[PDB]
Curated annotation (Swiss-Prot):
WD repeats lie at residues 60-102, 105-146, 148-187, 236-274, 286-327, 330-370, 377-417, 421-454, 478-518, 521-567, 582-622, 625-665. It comes from Homo sapiens (Human). This is Gem-associated protein 5. The lineage of its organism: Eukaryota, Metazoa, Chordata, Craniata, Vertebrata. Changing residue 239 to A: Abolishes interaction with U4 snRNA. Abolishes interaction with the 7-methylguanosine cap of RNA molecules. No effect on interaction with SMN complex. The record marks 31, 237, 288, 312, 334, 375, 379, 423, 501, 524 as: Interaction with U4 snRNA.
Length: 667
RNA sequence: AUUU
């Protein structure tokens, strides 16, 4: 009933690239964007379901976003600033998602930036050579400052004194400077011996600093307290970030080894007293280092804390209980592949370019983002996935290095791996009946080099057969076989279609892959073939076959006549049954609606997905939410109006045809 | 230090 977005992962090793304002709104830098998430009653979630929603994106930087900071000035919580490896500092208005103004004053990679808690239009940024800019965005003024010739890691403007800024460097140096006196160093805080977070005591000073040296140091405007991180059982090097809660100044929250969060008790100074977050609940803690911690006080006054992590989860912590309220997962690579299980309805496998398979339990009642990760034996970009049609938990996958594997997602065992590799990327995986020389279902894998292998899913480490030998023998072929780029079995298991590099599609019949038809329609490499399902209103529809190539135009063919005549010599088809025009770039994926007769969705490099009434050649609905090139699409199993798509923007969107404003792709 |  509402959209969802699995977004790109929060950027790593950035001291402040996420922030939140009251009510409220969380933003996080991810790749070249900032993603915005409404949190609390304003998200409008059912009681029990986590009160967050992904609501927007700040689009316009051309390289990695390294910094993000909201304004914390009442009445302008809608303003925020970003830094980027594109060299710019931008001021944005999240109401319109547009740039207010920006500068390109830095000449070296920007490290971070901070919006002044005291001056309404002042943003202070710092770079890898040590240069600092003060930017008063709303009066067109700026000032460069240069304190020490060292790489800035972090910077925090005082909450109390408008001229005072603390800066932390790569080498462990910390300084408090006065920006009204050309950045004069007012205090040099000597103590740390490796990379510097800086949090000021929220009552009027003390500063706390967190370091790669595994210490938190609390200083006076001289050191007053050194806290070494504890070594705890597990359940990269350290990143040590801090949140000093403004309403509980005797508490200090830190990250720790492995992404554990601690609440330190500053009253019990000496004894290094802390309380571990999530200490009761099992497996809700982060599993890798935490980079940023952002407090968010909701309008119903719940105190929350958002964490970002190298584990690719964003977690929301309830400060009253220190338990995890909810988790938003994210993706660290292209979304190459989507596959829904026929056995466990709603179980959605996603093949991602960060080397981890995701299985999204899409129908989870109380969680819109119930995602589990599978990393064992994967280790490269997962470019193809296909669930077994009847065996629960059985997930085939393929990779950009030619590897084919079989997961049991109901176990914790590493997957079985095929001993035979493809030379190139595994494009497609499909189950179907075995064919000679193999002896219920075989696994078929098509690689970019053009071979389709038949694997025995019980003996994966055994022999896998190039099906071209059977095709050659059964059809008495003398010349070299086409370079196969796609495989798709008809739903009855009786006909295999191969799509080829030269654009042709070939139709083969069991048992021996006798060729019965060649379709010559596409003039470029075939990327996707899909056969219509068998549960529509007329049996004729199971003969419909949609296909897409590196050209924009989609075809449907109707293979009833040829299949039913079982010819002794093959037929050539050169006219389409239906033609679907509208896209403006290559077609990566086509899928038929299981809820309708003759309804198709297509994904394109044009950045859109299109829903078609294929039988009337009528475009119905065009989705434009992705920023990237779409690679995969799949209809939701229970909602006729809901479709999932994945793209090279590192996003998976779940979207509703009823909420989309266009009927056809951009011209 | 991942972001094709």
């Amino acid at each position: 009933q509402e959209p969802r977005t699995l977004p790109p992962s929060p950027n790593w090793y950035c001291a402040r690239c996420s922030d939140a304002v009251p009510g409220g709104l969380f933003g996080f830098a991810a790749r070249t964007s900032v993603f915005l998430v409404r949190v609390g009653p304003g998200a409008g979630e059912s009681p029990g379901t986590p009160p967050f929603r992904v609501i927007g994106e700040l689009v316009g930087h051309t390289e990695r976003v390294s910094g993000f900071t909201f304004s914390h000035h009442p009445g302008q919580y809608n303003l925020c600033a970003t830094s980027s490896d594109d060299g710019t500092v931008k001021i944005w208005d999240v109401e319109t998602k547009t740039v207010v103004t920006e500068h390109a004053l830095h000449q070296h990679t920007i490290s971070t930036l901070h919006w002044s808690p005291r001056v309404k239009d002042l943003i202070v940024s710092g770079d890898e050579k040590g240069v600092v800019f003060c930017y008063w965005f709303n009066r067109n003024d700026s000032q460069h400052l240069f304190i020490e010739p060292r790489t800035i890691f972090c910077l925090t403007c005082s909450p109390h004194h408008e001229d005072l800024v603390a800066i932390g460097y790569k080498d462990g140096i910390v300084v408090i400077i006065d920006i009204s006196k050309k950045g004069e160093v007012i205090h040099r805080l000597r103590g740390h011996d490796d990379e510097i977070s800086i949090a000021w005591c929220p009552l009027p000073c003390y500063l706390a600093t967190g370091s790669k040296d595994q210490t938190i140091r609390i200083w006076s405007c001289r050191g007053v307290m050194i806290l070494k991180l504890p070594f705890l059982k597990r359940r990269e090097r350290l990143w040590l970030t801090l949140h000093w809660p403004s309403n509980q100044p005797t508490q200090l929250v830190s990250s720790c080894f492995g992404g554990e969060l601690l609440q330190w008790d500053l009253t019990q100074s000496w004894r290094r007293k802390y309380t571990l977050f999530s200490a009761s609940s099992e497996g809700q803690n982060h599993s890798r280092i935490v980079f940023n911690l952002c407090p968010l006080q909701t309008e119903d006054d719940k105190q929350l804390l958002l964490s970002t992590s190298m584990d690719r989860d964003v977690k929301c912590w309830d400060i009253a209980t220190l338990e995890c309220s909810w988790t938003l997962p994210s993706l660290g690579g292209f979304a190459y592949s989507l596959a829904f299980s026929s056995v466990d309805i709603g179980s959605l496998a996603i093949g991602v370019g960060d080397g981890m398979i995701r299985v999204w339990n899409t129908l989870s009642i109380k969680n819109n983002y119930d995602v589990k990760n599978f990393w064992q034996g994967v280790k490269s970009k997962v470019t193809a996935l296909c669930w077994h049609p009847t065996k629960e938990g059985c997930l085939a996958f393929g990779t950009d290095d030619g590897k084919v594997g079989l997961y049991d997602t109901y176990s914790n065992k590493p997957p079985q791996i095929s001993s035979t590799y493809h030379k190139k990327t595994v494009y497609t995986l499909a189950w179907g009946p075995p064919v000679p020389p193999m002896s219920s279902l075989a696994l078929y894998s098509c690689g970019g080099e053009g071979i389709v292998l038949q694997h025995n899913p019980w003996k994966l480490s055994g022999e896998a057969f190039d099906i071209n030998k059977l095709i050659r023998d059964t059809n008495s072929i003398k010349y070299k076989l086409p370079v196969h780029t796609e495989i798709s079995w008809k739903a009855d298991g009786k006909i295999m279609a191969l799509g080829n590099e030269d654009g042709s599609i070939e139709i083969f019949q069991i048992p021996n892959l006798k060729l019965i038809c060649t379709i010559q329609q596409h003039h470029k490499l075939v990327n996707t073939i899909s056969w219509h399902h068998e549960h529509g209103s007329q049996p004729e529809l199971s003969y419909l076959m949609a296909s897409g190539s590196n050209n924009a135009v989609i075809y449907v063919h109707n293979l009833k006549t040829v299949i039913e005549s079982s010819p002794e010599s093959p037929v050539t088809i050169t006219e389409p049954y239906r033609t679907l025009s509208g896209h403006t770039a290559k077609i990566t994926s086509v899928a038929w609606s299981p809820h309708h007769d003759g309804r198709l969705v297509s994904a394109s490099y044009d950045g859109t997905a299109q829903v078609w009434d294929a039988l009337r050649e009528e475009p119905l609905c065009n989705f434009r939410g992705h920023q990237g090139r779409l690679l995969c699409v799949a209809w939701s199993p229970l909602d006729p109006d809901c479709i999932y798509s994945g793209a090279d923007d590192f996003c998976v969107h779940k979207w509703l045809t009823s909420m989309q404003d266009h009927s056809r792709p951009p011209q």
